[PDB]
C-alpha cells in the first residue's frame, strides 16, 4: 500500500493491513482510473477526444512513490490548447500557453496524516516533482495530475487543463469520490474496524401517507398486542372476578394481503399463572 | 481561456449484464473478480442466480388459492 508509518506500531500496523487487505490500494486505483476513463469517454464529443486509453502500467506502479508510468493518455484530433499549470481553485486561463496533440492524467493515491493533510500543497509539490524529473516518463509534456487523500477523503488536481474541461473534471472527481465502489467499501471497512456505527435512521412512524400508499406496499401486516393478552373477566357481586385468559390470537390483519392472520394459541399458553403484562 | 463550455451531464453509473444499477458491494465484487481473473465458484454462482430469480419473482408480484379453499366448508 501507500501508507507511510514512522516507528513500528503493531496495533496500527495490524489495523492498516486489515483495512487494506487483498490489494485494496491497487483496487481503488483501478476503480478511480476506470471511472475517469468512462467519464472521459462519455463526454468525448465536446473534448474532441480521439483516443482515451491507459498505458501498460506495472502492477506495483499503483502505490509507487513516483508516477513513472502515466495513468491515462488522451490524444485529440489535430491540436489541443493548454494553459499554464495551476490548481483547480483558479479561474483565469490563457490556452495560448502551449499547443499539444496529447494529454496525460495521473491519479495520486495518498494517505494524509494530521500534519500532511494539505491536499492542495501536496498536489502542487507532487506535480512539480513528478513532472520535472528524469525518472518519470510522461508521453505528453502537458497534462494534469489528480490526487486523492484517502484519510482526508479529499480530491484535488494540479497542472494544465483541456479547454472547458476544468469544471468537467472537478464535477467528475466530486461525483466519483461521492459514490466510488472501492472507496465506499473502504469507508465501510473503516466504519466496521473502528466500531463507529452509522447514525441510525428515523423510521417513518407516521402512517397518514402510508395509509394512502398501503396498496403500494408489496407486503404489510398488523397485529394487535392486546388481543393476544386479552383476558375475559367474570362478574360477581361477592366472588372475585375471574380474569381468565381468552385466547392467544392477536387479531392480526393485512388488508394489502387480502387476508388476515389468526395466531390462535391456548388461553393458558397465552397467559400463564401469575404472568405479568411484560 | 475562451472555452465557453457547458455543464457536463456525465454521472457515475455502473452497468451489469442486465443493465440494472448495481449496489457498491456488487460493483466491488465485479472489480475483484476481474482483478484476480476469476469469479466465484459453482455453488456461489448457483446461489447468486437463485437469489436473482427470487428477486425477479418478488418484483413481478398466493391468497386467492387460500380464499378459494376456505370457501369450501
Amino acid at each position: 500500500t501507500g501508507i507511510f508509518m514512522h516507528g513500528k506500531i503493531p496495533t496500527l500496523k495490524i489495523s492498516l493491513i486489515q483495512i487494506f487487505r487483498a490489494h485494496l490500494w491497487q483496487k481503488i486505483h483501478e476503480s478511480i482510473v476506470m471511472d475517469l476513463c468512462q467519464v472521459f469517454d462519455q463526454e468525448l464529443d465536446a473534448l474532441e477526444i480521439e483516443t482515451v486509453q491507459k498505458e501498460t502500467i506495472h502492477p506495483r506502479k499503483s502505490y509507487k512513490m513516483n508516477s513513472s508510468c502515466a495513468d491515462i493518455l488522451l490524444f485529440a484530433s489535430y491540436k489541443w490548447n493548454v494553459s499554464r499549470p495551476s490548481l483547480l481553485a483558479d479561474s483565469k486561463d490563457v490556452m495560448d500557453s502551449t499547443t499539444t496533440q496529447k494529454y496525460w492524467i495521473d491519479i495520486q493515491l495518498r494517505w494524509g496524516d494530521y500534519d500532511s493533510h494539505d491536499i492542495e500543497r501536496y498536489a502542487r509539490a507532487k506535480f512539480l516533482d513528478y513532472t520535472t524529473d528524469n525518472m518519470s516518463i510522461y508521453p505528453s509534456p502537458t497534462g494534469v495530475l489528480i490526487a486523492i487523500d484517502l484519510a482526508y477523503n479529499l480530491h484535488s488536481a494540479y497542472g494544465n487543463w483541456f479547454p472547458g474541461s476544468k469544471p468537467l473534471i472537478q464535477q467528475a472527481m466530486a461525483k466519483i469520490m461521492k459514490a466510488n465502489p472501492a472507496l465506499y467499501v473502504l469507508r465501510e471497512r473503516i466504519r466496521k474496524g473502528l466500531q463507529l456505527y452509522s447514525s441510525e435512521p428515523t423510521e417513518p412512524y407516521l402512517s397518514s401517507q402510508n395509509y394512502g400508499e398501503l396498496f403500494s406496499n408489496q407486503i404489510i401486516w398488523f397485529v394487535d398486542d392486546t388481543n393476544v393478552y386479552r383476558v375475559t373477566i367474570h362478574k360477581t357481586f361477592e366472588g372475585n372476578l375471574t380474569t381468565k385468559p381468552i385466547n392467544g390470537a392477536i387479531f392480526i390483519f393485512n388488508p394489502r394481503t387480502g387476508q388476515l392472520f389468526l395466531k390462535i394459541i391456548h388461553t393458558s399458553v397465552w397467559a400463564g399463572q401469575k404472568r405479568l403484562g411484560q | 481561456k475562451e472555452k465557453d463550455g457547458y455543464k457536463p451531464d456525465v454521472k457515475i453509473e455502473y452497468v451489469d449484464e442486465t443493465g440494472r444499477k448495481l449496489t457498491p458491494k456488487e460493483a466491488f465484487r465485479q472489480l475483484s473478480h476481474r482483478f484476480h481473473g476469476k469469479g466465484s465458484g459453482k455453488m456461489k454462482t448457483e446461489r447468486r442466480m437463485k437469489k436473482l430469480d427470487e428477486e425477479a419473482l418478488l418484483k413481478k408480484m398466493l391468497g386467492t388459492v387460500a380464499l378459494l379453499q376456505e370457501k369450501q366448508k
Partner: peptide, 22 residues
C-alpha cells in the same frame, strides 16, 4: 442515456506479461 459495460485488467494471477495488459 446509455452506458456500455466497463472492462478491467486482470493483474492478479496473470503470467502472460509482467506489466498489466491494456
Amino acid at each position: 442515456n446509455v452506458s456500455q459495460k466497463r472492462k478491467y485488467r486482470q493483474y492478479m494471477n496473470r503470467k502472460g506479461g509482467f506489466n498489466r495488459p491494456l
